[PDB]
Amino acid sequence: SFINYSSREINCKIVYYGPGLCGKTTNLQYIYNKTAAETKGKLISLSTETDRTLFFDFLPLSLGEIRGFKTRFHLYTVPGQVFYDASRKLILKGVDGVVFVADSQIERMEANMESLENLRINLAEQGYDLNKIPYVIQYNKRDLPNAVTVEEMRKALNHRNIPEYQAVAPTGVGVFDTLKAVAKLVLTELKKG
Ligand SMILES: Nc1nc2c(ncn2[C@@H]2O[C@H](COP(=O)(O)OP(=O)(O)O)[C@@H](O)[C@H]2O)c(=O)[nH]1
């Protein structure tokens, strides 16, 4: 997190992680579209011929102050192509909370398992433990007929039983529950050491 003493703001970064086409862009799009226009900044997409990154920040107009400071949240997706790992590392630097978006399709489970490990390693490179930091997992695409049961997705992707949420991101099911969960964990950490 970054404390700005001029604007009296605690800036926090939340990174949506996961394999290609799992639903990160959709999560951030739905969050942005439902956020009050006076509290959010510009939604910015950085695209190439093969990949993209989406990010924006907002000031939750609910949400009390912490020692006089208001909290600003910056949401980032991560690129999905194998050759942008450096970018992913750069986006994870200084992360405060992480959401892992899992594609519940059986044909993507292996992909999920890869991305998860890629998250772990990357955090471990910067000195942090995925099990110790604010972190929730989202089982997305529950509407699809090839969606894996929650118990098997948990056996594969959430063996230490961190908070998990089921979602159909295009319609908005589970999106704001996930966001609220990871934001609550981040704020609890902010009110401590
Ligand atoms: N049926 C279904 N489709 C989804 C869901 N979430 C995302 N999609 C679709 O999956 C495709 C990839 O989603 P996107 O957010 O762009 O993936 P990203 O690479 O992780 O950002 C898009 O065409 C979405 O419409 C879901 O929960 N259910």
Contacts of 182 (CB under 8 A, 6+ apart): 14, 97, 98, 99, 134, 135, 136
| Contacts of the segment 63-68: beta carbons below 8 A, 24+ positions apart | 66/10, 66/187, 66/190, 66/191, 68/8
Instruction: Output the CA angle 146-147-152, nearest 5 degrees.
Output: 125
Question: Is residue 74 classed exposed, middle or buried when 0-12, 13-18 and 19+ CB atoms within 10 A define those classes?
Answer: middle
CA of 36 to the centre of ligand 1 (A): 23
Read off φ and ψ for residue 135, nearest 5 degrees: -160, 125
By the 8 A CB rule, do 25 and 44 touch? no
Classified as helix, coil or strand, 192 is coil
| 75: nearest Cα among 112, 115, 43 | 43
d(CA 159, CA 113) in angstroms, rounded, equals 12
Q: Which residues pair with 136 in a beta bridge?
A: 99
Experimentally determined by: X-ray
H runs (alpha helix) in the chain: 24-34, 85-92, 109-125, 150-157, 175-190
Provide the annotated binding site. 18-25, 77-81, 140-143
What CATH number corresponds to the domain at position 88? 3.40.50.300
Mutation pick for ligand 1 pocket among 16, 17, 21, 100 (CB with most ligand atoms within 8 Å): 21
Read off φ and ψ for residue 122, nearest 5 degrees: -60, -45
By the 8 A CB rule, do 114 and 76 touch? no
133, amino acid identity = I
44's tokens:
């910015």
Nearest CA to ligand 1 atom 7: 23
Q: How far is CA 57 from the centre of its chain?
A: 13
Beta strands in 52-178 (DSSP E): 52-58, 70-76, 97-103, 135-140, 164-166
Looking at residue 168, what DSSP letter applies? Answer: B
Nearest CA to ligand 1 atom 6: 23
Q: Which residues pair with 107 in a beta bridge?
A: none
By the 8 A CB rule, do 116 and 78 touch? no
Domain housing 54: 1-193
CB atoms within 10 A of CB 112: 24
Query: Residues with beta carbon inside 6 Å of ligand 1?
Result: 18, 20-26, 77, 80, 140-141, 143-144, 168-170
Number of structural domains (the chain) is: 1
By the 8 A CB rule, do 73 and 58 touch? yes
